[PDB]
Amino acid sequence: MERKISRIHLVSEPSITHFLQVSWEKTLESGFVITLTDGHSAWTGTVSESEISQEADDMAMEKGKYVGELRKALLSGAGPADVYTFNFSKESCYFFFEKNLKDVSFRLGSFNLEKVENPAEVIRELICYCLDTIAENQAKNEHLQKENERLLRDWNDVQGRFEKCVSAKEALETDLYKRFILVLNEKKTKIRSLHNKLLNA
Amino acid sequence: KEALETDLYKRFILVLNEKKTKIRSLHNKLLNA
Amino acid sequence: AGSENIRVKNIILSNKHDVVKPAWLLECFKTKSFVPWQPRFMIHMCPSTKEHFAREYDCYGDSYFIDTDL
């Protein structure tokens, strides 16, 4: 059950903005339930696989392209590509959304919604979902920020350790070589002393 | 660091072993003469 | 011979002559004297030189009686 909310400015009443919530079980292709709200009244509708197939066949284009366009229009994922306009007759529950370009309008999708007896339940459900999402997002952000701070501290510590290692690298070799020189000099002293003693005979 | 250490120590032990053989051989002749 | 050319490889494989690095020559012209031969400059040792240096220096360039520096 994945749902997404979006804002729409109906042509009939542009001043007032309405909220459309679309929820689907597995994917938008299988079907989705739409709920339109404005703060005073709410309307509900459903779209199944048969309706989407009929719309695709009537529009005569690839199913994937139709699904993508419908998702972009309903979820408000569009950028500057185009402008989608939505109309909804409050006295007929005949909602429909199209896209406008170069003074050309094409009917993209149409649904027949149904009014709900009580809008309080749906409004409360939407607000509760939004609040839960906000709380979960805040918790995840705080946890990730703490993890990032820990990672930064660890990076600083390891960088300091690397600096210490590189600094000591050359001192190790210098001490090794001078110690080698001392021991070799002592051994050479011993060898020459024995040589002198032996040749004394 | 490990590679450098092992290489340097191998050279060290080789040189020291050669010097040890030389000292032992030179000392061996003391008893003979 | 400074570079190990094919001629240098052939002569060193001969085992009858000793090769000396050019560096020694340069030193000979800096002190205005003859620098005694040392393993630091030699690239190969003739049998007589090998026998002479066997009891005077290691199989490598390490010193026997005189102290060594860095």
Swiss-Prot record, chain B:
Q: Which residues carry this modification: Phosphoserine?
A: S25
Q: Which disease is it linked to?
A: Short stature, microcephaly, and endocrine dysfunction: A disease characterized by short stature and microcephaly apparent at birth, progressive postnatal growth failure, and endocrine dysfunction. In affected adults endocrine features include hypergonadotropic hypogonadism, multinodular goiter, and diabetes mellitus. Variable features observed in some patients are progressive ataxia, and lymphopenia or borderline leukopenia.
Organism listed in the record? Homo sapiens
Q: Which superkingdom heads the taxonomic lineage of this protein's source?
A: Eukaryota
User: What family does this chain come from, according to its entry?
Assistant: Belongs to the XRCC4-XLF family. XRCC4 subfamily.
Localization: Nucleus; Chromosome
Can you say what this protein is called?
Answer: DNA repair protein XRCC4
- Where does the record place a coiled coil? 16-33
Q: What's the reported outcome of changing E2A?
A: Abolished DNA-binding
Extract the ranges annotated as region (Interaction with LIG4): 12-33
The major lineage groups are: Eukaryota, Metazoa, Chordata, Craniata, Vertebrata
Please tell me in which tissues this protein is expressed. Widely expressed.
PTM (free text) = Phosphorylations by PRKDC at the C-terminus of XRCC4 and NHEJ1/XLF are highly redundant and regulate ability of the XRCC4-NHEJ1/XLF subcomplex to bridge DNA. Phosphorylation by PRKDC does not prevent interaction with NHEJ1/XLF but disrupts ability to bridge DNA and promotes detachment from DNA. Monoubiquitinated.
UniProtKB/Swiss-Prot annotation, chain C:
Q: What sections of the sequence does the record tag as coiled-coil?
A: none
Localization annotation? Nucleus
Give expression by tissue: Testis, thymus, prostate and heart.
Name the domain of life this protein comes from. Eukaryota
Cysteines joined through disulfide linkages? none
Q: Which disease is it linked to?
A: LIG4 syndrome: Characterized by immunodeficiency and developmental and growth delay. Patients display unusual facial features, microcephaly, growth and/or developmental delay, pancytopenia, and various skin abnormalities.
How the protein assembles, per its UniProt entry? Interacts with XRCC4; the LIG4-XRCC4 subcomplex has a 1:2 stoichiometry and XRCC4 is required for LIG4 stability. Component of the core long-range non-homologous end joining (NHEJ) complex (also named DNA-PK complex) composed of PRKDC, LIG4, XRCC4, XRCC6/Ku70, XRCC5/Ku86 and NHEJ1/XLF. Additional component of the NHEJ complex includes PAXX. Following autophosphorylation, PRKDC dissociates from DNA, leading to formation of the short-range NHEJ complex, composed of LIG4, XRCC4, XRCC6/Ku70, XRCC5/Ku86 and NHEJ1/XLF. Interacts with DCLRE1C; the interaction is direct. Interacts with APLF.
The Swiss-Prot or TrEMBL record describes its family as follows: Belongs to the ATP-dependent DNA ligase family.
Purpose of the protein: DNA ligase involved in DNA non-homologous end joining (NHEJ); required for double-strand break (DSB) repair and V(D)J recombination. Catalyzes the NHEJ ligation step of the broken DNA during DSB repair by resealing the DNA breaks after the gap filling is completed. Joins single-strand breaks in a double-stranded polydeoxynucleotide in an ATP-dependent reaction. LIG4 is mechanistically flexible: it can ligate nicks as well as compatible DNA overhangs alone, while in the presence of XRCC4, it can ligate ends with 2-nucleotides (nt) microhomology and 1-nt gaps.
The name of this protein is DNA ligase 4
The beginning of the lineage is: Eukaryota, Metazoa, Chordata, Craniata, Vertebrata
Gene encoding this chain?
LIG4
- Boundaries of the shown chain within the full protein: 702 to 771 of 911
